Amino acid sequence: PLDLALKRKYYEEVRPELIRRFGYQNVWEVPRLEKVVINQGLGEAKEDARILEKAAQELALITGQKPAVTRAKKSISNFKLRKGMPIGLRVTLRRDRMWIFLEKLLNVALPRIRDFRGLNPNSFDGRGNYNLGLREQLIFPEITYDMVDALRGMDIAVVTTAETDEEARALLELLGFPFRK
């Protein structure tokens, strides 16, 4: 299914625009999107193994991919956690399923967000990448209201060949990211 809006949006719009604001020399130097990642701190689903499957399957739909698991290693004595047992949710996506997700993002999720204002332009890792947090997961389309047993939060990230956050801000804004200016 190699075809979509954001797809060509990067090629026939952002690609040349990046050659304007800074100008490059090689097509392999222009900041390219290539890795989106999700995550869910599930110290909650520690007790119930059932609540873990729920978050992963709800995740499987919104990510349009296959969920994964990643337990802890240390030992949060303070919060009933220790060595190798609990859980942490994560799912990496790229290529096509990456673009399709970014579509639901700035076109379905972000819009109907609780009094959405934008995306904090400080959330940059300093380098050419970005990380954002999100509460309600039901903000995603296919997610039904009479189904979410809990408003399990989660935060996502996204990698890019960029090396300066200025290129990141420019790139992302051109990508359709509504930054809270």
Partner: peptide, 30 residues
Amino acid sequence: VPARIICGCGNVIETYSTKPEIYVEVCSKC
């Protein structure tokens, strides 16, 4: 499958996701 977001304000986008009949609202169109 082409998920057609039918947000009730004047926007029907053909993305990709489970079930094309995606009933939404208050999308980027408004």
